Amino acid sequence: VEVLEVKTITEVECFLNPEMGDPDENLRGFSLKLSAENDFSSDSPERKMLPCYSTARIPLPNLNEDLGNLLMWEAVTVQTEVIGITSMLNLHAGSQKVHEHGGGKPIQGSNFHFFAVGGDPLEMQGVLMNYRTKYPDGTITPKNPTAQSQVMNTDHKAYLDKNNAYPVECWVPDPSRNENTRYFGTFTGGENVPPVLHVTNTATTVLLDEQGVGPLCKADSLYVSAADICGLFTNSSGTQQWRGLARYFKIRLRKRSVKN
Amino acid sequence: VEVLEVKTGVDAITEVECFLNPEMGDPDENLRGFSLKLSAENDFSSDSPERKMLPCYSTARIPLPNLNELMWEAVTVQTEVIGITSMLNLHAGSQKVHEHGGGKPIQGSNFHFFAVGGDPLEMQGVLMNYRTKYPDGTITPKNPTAQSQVMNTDHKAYLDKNNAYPVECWVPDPSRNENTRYFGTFTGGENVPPVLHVTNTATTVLLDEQGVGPLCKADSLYVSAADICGLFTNSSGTQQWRGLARYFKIRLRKRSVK
Amino acid sequence: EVLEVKTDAITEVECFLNPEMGDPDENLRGFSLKLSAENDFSSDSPERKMLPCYSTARIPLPNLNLLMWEAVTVQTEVIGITSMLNLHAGSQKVHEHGGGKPIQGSNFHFFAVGGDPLEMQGVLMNYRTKYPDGTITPKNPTAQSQVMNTDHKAYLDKNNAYPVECWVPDPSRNENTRYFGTFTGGENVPPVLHVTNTATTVLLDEQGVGPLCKADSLYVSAADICGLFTNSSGTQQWRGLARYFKIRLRKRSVK
Amino acid sequence: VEVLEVKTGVDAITEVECFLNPEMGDPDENLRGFSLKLSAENDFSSDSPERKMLPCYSTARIPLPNLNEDLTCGNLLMWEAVTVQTEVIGITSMLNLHAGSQKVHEHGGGKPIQGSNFHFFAVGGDPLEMQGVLMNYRTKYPDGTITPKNPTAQSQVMNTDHKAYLDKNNAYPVECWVPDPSRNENTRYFGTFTGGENVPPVLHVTNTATTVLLDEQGVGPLCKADSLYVSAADICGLFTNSSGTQQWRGLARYFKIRLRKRSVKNP
């Protein structure tokens, strides 16, 4: 695409639900109880235990009254926020007491907060803790992995082209691709890591690259992608479940001239 | 409203201030600023918190000098939490950290939140457990389903009543609040240290990218807060939320609109 | 009504303000008395030497009479932070054969500069606390004293009298003072303290006007509770350190 | 490794992309990216770590296209490294708490990777220059490592004898070597060490972040003999097996380096 001038503005928005595994009709936003200590040679996680990347396609009207200069929608900025962070102030429901006569144990531990906005589906690279993991039906995971899949195996290239299918533990945004997508992620690992989450409607991320060009909706589609694993919920029984929250996107779009 | 020039001249600027008291539950006439002791381990199917156990959002409407329906535009807010040094009382009520030790400081999950707008703060409901049975005198997501544990777009409310909207049920709605600025941080965990800053030299600019602050519909300014500071641990081991008041000083200017 | 800056018109004053942690005996200057624990709210009578108090000094300036001294910048630093590397004196072993336990836990680092005494707001953990003789604490407190009670207005007008647990800088006043404080609470919080002679705080407000020394007096105020010292026995004491101030002042014309 | 002519001619830009694999020890064919289980409590006098227990620096030399038709000319062209974008690849793999790791408590999930970590990269036109420092000068290092020669007690602080080039992949143990701030005129390096048993790994990914490699004079690393050097160490923490044994976990590092042609005086 040869990018020309800006045509001299609309907003689109989405609340993207998290895909934590949802083990029954009442535990929407939670994973299945976590298993532990599986040998690498016999590691068969159940589908409902594995959080997956969330994604939605926002369709836009074509701008070309007549198909040398075309018009495409261009993403300029995004406002994004994790939705429901105060829900972790419920220490009365389900959580193990911190000590005798105490309140419930807060959600805490390993967390991952990630979003992307592009004119194409997110491009991902596969990396596994254990190349021998047997992944369950309904997941899409690195094909024909080897030991090299525990470091970098360039065979593992995927599109985030399906909601609730690509396990977060198997896939990362690919920095060698995503020419038409901007992505941002923080991983914080550990048993006792405190969740730290900020809300403000005053924060904007600018999506323009070094040349002042945002993601271009080449096929009149805008892609939003997220993963928001807030930490682990510890049941009275001792079992643990991932908890996730929805993510809001508001994307400012403008019309961009291009050659064709 | 189409937004035109800032009006300057005599009486084209005002400053209003307020202290918003916290609404932590106030379980008896002597424990203002605390919640009732926390229950733990309720099954999701049998979760009935008492009103006095549930911290709520604080909110107040500040009347502004009457303009002929020019609007008042909020430009800056100075805000801080009041009484942070009260947590240096380790002689009263708190469980000793060990034999012959001082009392356990307040610590654990905390939430620090404030909003300034020309409309009531617009909130979105999200629940830990959609089956929680909330008590009389609370306003909570109406007729929740399983999706209410993630995003259910039916749960929209105005923060239109003090000491009524539980903090655990509601967040500011980023899809609305065109005319409000809000700021919050949640830090969760049993051992989280409270970290609180005071200074009269720090100001938050409420102007958007176009240089426009909250516009005060009907000459009313809305302030909102939640300052849950952590958990107080009694000698028995029981725990109570502790909250503190928030101060607001808001500078406004007259703005022409069409 | 503040006119022009006069351009021998720039003075410096410096001060080392000692902490007031309670000083339970003549050897334990800079420490509090052993902390008590688990007093019922209905019977909470803390001893004076257990309560750290705000430090303050009034620095008299030459009477220029109008012209007034205007405070423009402050350089400030907590003094003796390396003393906490002494883990051989008095502190409880971390484990068998281990060194002493570091000072750690709740801390409060605060300073103010103005041309009037620091204006303070009262707030209490427990309104029913019975405070000892020699302390100045909220008068006629109620349950609302545990949140915001506008009755509790004080001037920091006596050194070693206003307990830190009772009083905060009042953001509704202090027109003629700049104040800065950080509270970090918790059982095991690490003290984190920086020293540099390269850091300056500007005291000018939005209109370029610093505190104005009313009656030719400059006011410095501080509280530097570093955390808790844990004795061998398990008893705990607050530890505090002195604060340095170097303040640049200029002559300002006023109507 | 991709070397791409993005733009040609006088204002030519070349982008070099590459994924540098970590060198954590790889104790068996299935545990690529992990070390051998850590030993503990070896007396200083009797400290003989096994090869596969010792994470090493990663490095590679990337040959660039020759720019000089005539080597006699008064001016010669050199590739100059202007910017780098870099991140650690596969950080979400640590959300697998079902494989191999000690349960946090009865009926709990696996223990996350955590503890001491080191994240480091360098981009230069010469091999990264390193200074040796040892915890224990009397350590006996295994065949296949390059470690400080004839160490003394002074090697536990600063011994200026211990100078090396990072000139071999999977050979220089991280615990023996640091980048040398007294040299590296033609390299830019960046590292953070975080020590402690329960240190949480904190890793950021974004394709929007760029590090500028220009010095105060506006000059990037100059690729001597058309050679670009990439170096990394990304020890993420310790993986704790159900037995309680611990292994270093490392991840690959991505580099995207932007280069332009600088004219230099022919020496």
Next chain:
Amino acid sequence: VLEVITEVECFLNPEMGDPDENLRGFSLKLSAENDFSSDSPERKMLPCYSTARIPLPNLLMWEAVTVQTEVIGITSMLNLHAGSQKVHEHGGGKPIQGSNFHFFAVGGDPLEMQGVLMNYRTKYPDGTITPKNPTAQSQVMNTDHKAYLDKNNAYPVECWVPDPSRNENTRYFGTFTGGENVPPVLHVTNTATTVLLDEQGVGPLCKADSLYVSAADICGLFTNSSGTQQWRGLARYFKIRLRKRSV
């Protein structure tokens, strides 16, 4: 100071106590629980400030303009196989952690220090320079305790801080982080410069053609398998850019 280049460099060794010929960079094992009335620490237990006078080429004086500095050998703490207590059964060695202090100064005169003591009654050992005639006021601010950092391996870190009321001709920077379980966090990069010019663009001036560097880099406590603890310190590198200034 009237009208307005050379670079000097130094690797300054730490002075942690060096309890024997093999344990260079470590202190003697720490004592605990001494009564304030009987606290007599051994010299080899006490980390001291490091310092070096750097002689410079002889109405013109050398003005220090910038410093690059970093702590040398931080990756050496990734040796968890040697001497340290296992974190649990079958586990690796315990990382160096706990109270740390990282400090450096650049000046045209020796660093000026102020004495402050945890315990004024401490009896300090021969070979140390500590506050003279300490009183209870030495636990807070006692203006008697003034010293020059004029001897390497003599002034215990626990007794002395940089004096903010002097040091007209020195720039200094320190962070103290206290606590049993504090993680060391150390950064390396050759891309970082500290500018030593004051608000009027004047750097430290080297009177007597001498440049003074000072450091303390106590990284944390090393826990032996026995449970005994020792300070670990590391060297600091300095590269200082000077220019000629007319006086």
